[model samples]
Every structure is written in C-alpha cells, then in structure tokens.
Target chain A: KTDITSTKNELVITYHGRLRSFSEEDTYKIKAWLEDKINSNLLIEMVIPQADISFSDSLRLGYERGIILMKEIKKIYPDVVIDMSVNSAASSTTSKAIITTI
Target chain B: KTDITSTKNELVITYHGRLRSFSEEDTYKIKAWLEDKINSNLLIEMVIPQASDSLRLGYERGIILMKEIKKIYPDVVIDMSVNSAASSTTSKAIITTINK
Candidate 1:
C-alpha cells in the first residue's frame, strides 16, 4: 500500500511494507502530483527500513527503489536539479520514500 | 584554453582556467564529437578545483557547467555527482564523459 501526503512545499510517499515495486495506480498518482511541482528544486529522500534484513541488504534495496523512482521523476522533469538520497537509518518498521522541495 | 581528448569509450574535457562560460568553437567541437556517441550510458564526472574558493562555491560552479552541457545532450543521462579538490594555483573543471 502507498500513502501520499502533501503540504505547500513537501510531498511524502509512504510505503506500507518492504517496497518491491509500485503498482500502476501508484505510478499514475505520483506522476499527477508531480505535474505542477516539476520546476522546483527537488530533494528526494528515500527512507528504507531494515526490517528483518541486514544493514547492507537494506541499503542496497533502498538504492534500487530510489533509482526506480528517480527514473520516473526524471522522465518528467529532465532539467531540474534533483538531489537524491537513500537512507535506511530509521528505526521504523515501515519503509517510505519522501520528496521535498528546496 | 580548453582541451579535449578521447579514447574508445571515454572523453575528457579540461578547462585551463576558471570556467565562466563555454566558447562557441568549443561548443561546436563538443557537439560534433558527440554525434556518434549518444546511445551509451553517459557518466559525467565534473571535477572542480577549489582555488581559494569555498567547497560549496566550487560545487555550485560545477553544477552550472554541468547544466550547460546537459542542454546539448538532453537525451543522455548526466550524473549529478560533483567532485571538488583543493588547488591554490589553478581552477579547472575536468569533465570526463564515460560510456559504460
């Protein structure tokens, strides 16, 4: 499951569990939300939970997911400066990928 | 002055001094060289010299140049990572375009 929260300058996408892939619906939703926000400087913070996995494994998984989302975002906003990070340091059990504007 | 060198799968452009902008001659040269090398995965390494400048300043300069180059190669993927090194004598942006 995916949850999307948005304020004036921030957008957060929370994945319920370990994220393997995004559904078609989720992809469309994200694209729609990004239409008006493409011009801002985007800072993508991908947070991954260690869950039951090793630290190294979790970091690798987080990077994979981050790259997947980056490709989608880049497809729409090609010239914008996007600073992306994949972090697995959170103590939470759920993984999420959060994006904010600077 | 600017210098460009290339190998089978790598191209390197070295600017001799602090880069304010690209010359039209150099721009045309770069575009001509990129004609047949657009399909490969492009890794752009923008190395900046911190010559009496703050690290943040050097990074900002690198991004400016990177964006200028990206405009010429809009379809290629230009890596956003910028590298900065200490240099008191000279400042340069050494861009290595890799195909891998």
Candidate 2:
C-alpha cells in the first residue's frame, strides 16, 4: 500500500498481505477470525504483484551457501524475480492471499 | 492525535476533550469520550492513524501496572499509551482529557 489518508474526523486502520493465490471464500474465513478477537471493522483482499523483483536478499544468501538443486537452480538462473507488489489500499481493509509458484 | 485509515470495510474510532475546570454533572462521563473525539463525527479535529504499525499488543508491564493501580484507587484513569520494544506492534485504547 502507498500514499494513504483518512477521512476528516475519521480514524481508520488497514492490514494487508500477499499469498500464492486468491479466494473469496478463504478471505471470509480470515474475516471471521478478526471479528472473534477484535472489537473493530475488518476486510480482506487477494492480489498479485504488478511487477517482479529478480533479486532477493534471502535468495542471494542461499547463493552464498553454494547449495544446488531446483531451489538453488532457480536462484542461480540469474533472471529470477522477486516482488514488492503494490496494491490498491482500502480503509479498514485487511488483505491476505494464497498462491503457488509451481 | 494520529492520522489513520479504514474502509467501507474499515474500522473507525474517535475521541474529544471538553471540561469546565471540573464538573461531575457530566453525563455518561467518558463512555462518550471516544465518540467525543470524532467530528463530522466530532466537534474536535482528529484523525485515527492510517493502519497501525500493528493491530494490537498487550505488554506484561501494562497489565502489571493495571493491577497495581486498581488496588490503590477507587476510580483511576489508566493511560494506555505505553512504549515497548518487545511488543511495539500493538496499541490499546485509553482515557484522556483536553477540556479545561
């Protein structure tokens, strides 16, 4: 999320995260989770990265370890991407997702 | 005191301050304090912070203090704004004043 603001005289909060995929049914499961514990508004969303980052510090760390196999192979491939995707922000929204790279 | 955000699916909280030096004729006393902070919504200008660094946290020290104060005072107002490196991601509501 980027460049956020609240309504006049209104104070709001949001929580967001990314998953390998998106499912409304799964999202609702998270919604009920907050209601049970928090005494406040809650919303969820499923999203994807608009772009990708081929470089990741963790991945780079693995490379320094000299390990091999697909996990290492993917990292060694040189063009591998990492993502810090930007998503639309909504007040009171708590977004989460589930996805698969395979 | 802070700027914040919430959505159609967002949560909203507010607070306000008003006093006459001192008065017990006050109605609901502070049940309406949170409601008082909001304008449009509230008469006072305010903004709830945009998404908290955290959703919430309960420090061991804060609760310990609560128990301590409850023993000495009949009606003590707790200032929940505590700072902690161990549990910095959480925030709890509080009682406050601005009206003089």
Candidate 3:
C-alpha cells in the first residue's frame, strides 16, 4: 500500500507509481511531503520494485524510477543516509518509499 | 530471474519459485545444488520475494523456506539475510542466493 507518515524525527513516504514514467510532479509531490517533516537528520529505507517483466538483459524501468527518486530526494536533503533495495520478479506499478530518522 | 553459480571461495544459487508454496522439493533442490560447491567458510545472501498481492496480514512463505535452510546449514553459515517484497499479483519468486 502507498501511504505517507511523519513524526517529530521520523518521516516515511510511499509512492504508488508505474515503470518508465516518474514525473516531475511525483518528484515535487515527494518534495512537498518531506518539506514539512524532515529537517537536519534521518535515515531512509526505500523499497523499489521491478514492475515490468523483461526477459532480456535490458534496463529495468522501475529501478530507474527508484534511482530518480533517490537522486532528486538527495538533491533536496543531502544529509540523509538512504538505504535502498530492489525487488526481483516483483511487480508493483508502485514504488514504496520509506524514510526513518535516528 | 533465478540462477546458480559457484566458485572456489563462493557459490551462488538462484531460485525462481512461487509464494504460497515453498516445497520440500525446492529445499532438496537447493541442498543438492549446494552439495558439491559449498564447503566451509562461505557467506550466503538470499533474496526472497512475496509473490502475491496481500493488502493486510498473511504468511510469508519465503521466511519459512529460510528457516528450513537454516535448520540444515546452521553450523557452517553465520547469517542469512532475507530481503522480500510483495507484488500486486500472483507472481513467481525470483531469488538470487549468493554464497561467498
């Protein structure tokens, strides 16, 4: 499920998205979501799924979206240590983004 | 995306399976696959998958399989990391089990 949660020192954002299409709108949405909750310290864990099935050795679009999210989010909040992992044969036109603060 | 590879110091086994059932046949296949390649001093990294769509609570079959594997190889192996995720449909488990 895609959901977003925030606390005094913890923030989690979930993205329900499709492969090959991660928009600037989505990036901005995440930016908006984290703008209010995150500050100077946090640890983020992101679960990125391989949505589309590729029989050949090609670029995974879902993973690419995850990379985009990671990059853009890092641009805004450079101090956060984001840990991420990809799901194999896991189809979810959704990328669940999770952020936690210690 | 299941594959198996072995080296003098490392062995990697990949499993392409389903979610609801992690059978004894699967376990034995893994054991047979590792019967020759693995010796002592090896680290295993198993990537498990939740190959079904469940919005709420349910059994994680991969974790059950991990427990079975640990029961057999508890002496030599130090740790087993199970990284699992669910899909939106009835999908197959793609596990890249790495031994090093």
Candidate 4:
C-alpha cells in the first residue's frame, strides 16, 4: 500500500514495498498538493531501504523511482531538484519518498 | 537559420533568432547525438538573449523547448538550467551528456 501526507511545506509518500506504480488517486493527491503551492520550487528526496535489495540495486531503484516521480511533478511544476539515496539505517519494512518546498 | 554542432561531451543548437520550433532535421540530429551516448545524464542549458523580448518570455520559450526535447529522451535524466545573456548575437541551447 502507498499513502501520501502533506504539511505546510512538505509532502511525503510512504511505500509498503518496492515502488511498482502510482495509482490515479495517488497522482491526483500529488497534483493537488502542487496546485496549492503555486510556483514554488521543489526538492524531491527518494529513500530506498537497503534490506532485501543489494546496495547497487537499492541505489538503482532509488534513481529510477526518482526520475519517475520527477517526470510526474515536472508535468505540473517544471522546475524541481531530485535527490536519491539509500537509507542504510532504516528498517527492512520502511521506504519513503519526500517532496519539500525549496 | 538553425545549426547543431556537437563535440565529445556537448551538443549545441544555435538559433538565428527567437526560438520558434525545432525542425524535423533538428530533432533527428539531437536524437542521433543522444543515441551515440547511451545511458548518460544530460544537462540542457538554454541561453536566452535579452534583446527585444522580456526575460520572462525567454524563460517560457526555454521551458517549452525543453519539454519538446524531453519527449525524445524520456528515459535519461534531463535537467534544464536557463541562462540569460545581454550581448549574445544568437540564442542557443546546449545539451551536455555526461559520460557516466
């Protein structure tokens, strides 16, 4: 399962496992969040847990997922900065992607 | 007139005037360039001349052109950085494909 939560200046997407795809509802929520922010620049941070996946695989998955989300956000907000990393200390069950105003 | 020139690490599209559109031949050249450098990260720098047009219009044009090119290379990371010049004789967009 995937869930989205947003505060005043940041939004986070929590993923249960590997990111397969984004549901229509998920996309709508992301777009709505951007709509409220107007022309603000965004910094997208994609975190992949280094649990079952190899270190290289975790980095690759994080990069691929970052591009996927970057393309989606660029559809509404053309300008954005993307950062991808592996959360070495995160538990095996935790994976997340975060977007914040910058 | 528009011309495309590429080196070992960079490809530049020089426009004679305002960026109207990319010709079919132009698109082919860009794709050919990307095809040679597979799986590389790209930095697209759009330089606009602050002559007759407002800086805002220049940015809009750059963004539009960036999207147009983005359609060709969707798999690669294409980050666009816009720059403005006061004495540029012609507007140009540079695509730097970093060998990774």
All candidates' TM-scores? 0.46, 0.19, 0.38, 0.44
Tens-digit lDDT track of model 2 for B59-91: 222233233333343244322322223322323
lDDT (10s digit) by residue, model 1, range B21-86: 667876676677677766654555445543213333334444455455556765554443333444
Which candidate has the top score in lDDT? 4
| Per-candidate local distance difference test | 0.59, 0.26, 0.45, 0.64
True contacts kept of 3: 0.00
> Per-residue alpha-carbon lDDT of model 2 for A58-83, expressed as tens digits?
22222222121113223323433321
Arranged by lDDT with the best first, the candidates are 4, 1, 3, 2
Model 4 residue A42 distance off true place after TM-score fit, in angstroms: 1.0
Worst 10 residues of 2 chain B by lDDT: B39-48
TM for chain B in all models? 0.63, 0.26, 0.40, 0.77
Pairs that collide, model 4? none
Q: Which stretches of candidate 3 lie above 4 Å from their native place? A: A1-21, A40-59, A89-96, A99-102, B1-100
lDDT of 3: 0.45
Root-mean-square deviation of Cα positions for candidate 3 versus the true structure, in angstroms = 13.4
Which model scores highest in DockQ?
A: 3
DockQ of each two-chain model: 0.02, 0.01, 0.05, 0.02
Ranking by TM-score: 1, 4, 3, 2
- Candidate 1, which segments miss by more than 4 Å at Cα? A17-19, B1-100
